[PDB]
Design a protein around this ligand. Sequence first.
Ligand SMILES: *c1nc(N)c(C#N)nc1C#N
Ligand SMILES: *c1nc(N)c(C#N)nc1C#N
Ligand SMILES: [Zn+2]
Length: 197
Amino acid sequence: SSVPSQKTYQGSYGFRLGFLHSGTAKSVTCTYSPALNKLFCQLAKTCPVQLWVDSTPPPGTRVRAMAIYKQSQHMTEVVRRCPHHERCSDSDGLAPPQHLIRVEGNLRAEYLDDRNTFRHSVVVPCEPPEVGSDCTTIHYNYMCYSSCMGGMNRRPILTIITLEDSSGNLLGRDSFEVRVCACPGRDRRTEEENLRK
Ligand SMILES: *c1nc(N)c(C#N)nc1C#N
Ligand SMILES: *c1nc(N)c(C#N)nc1C#N
Ligand SMILES: [Zn+2]
């Protein structure tokens, strides 16, 4: 299965991701670590990702999200939900049950099973910032734990976000590592202290 590029590429529109500050409390459902470039989140909980461009992209620009495995041994294997989570009765009517990454609160979200690579992705219309903001925000959900055997199985994943034209040509790309886990605040503090070692 063809390996998608993970190379950062701001492109003509200066495309880049951002995250707002969230903290490492016990109650946190979703927290981003700059030092790790890693997002820590709970299963099926809102993950706000901020989109930035230097200049407005043409109408019909889209934003696609795709997971891949981080380690090179596994980057050819397709990231999918585990055999147990794909049988849950949890489809919002848009997301197919095998897809790890969902978009929350956007009826124009489209889900793709690539016919040649078999990789999953979810894609939405790029939209201008809502009233009184300077970022466009997309809300993602991750539908499998990182520990789920027969799925990610403790293998780290990257989420790749690509800005695309209406034909799906690349306009820009950014990415971040993801851990879906029960206590994200605790796990973020854990991994951050290790990197200081
Ligand atoms: C998914 N969906 C349901 N309803 C249950 C239960 N009980 N477990 C999973 C999983 N994994
Ligand atoms: C996507 N689409 C539009 N129209 C705008 C604006 N303004 N920003 C993005 C992004 N990111
Ligand atoms: Zn699972």
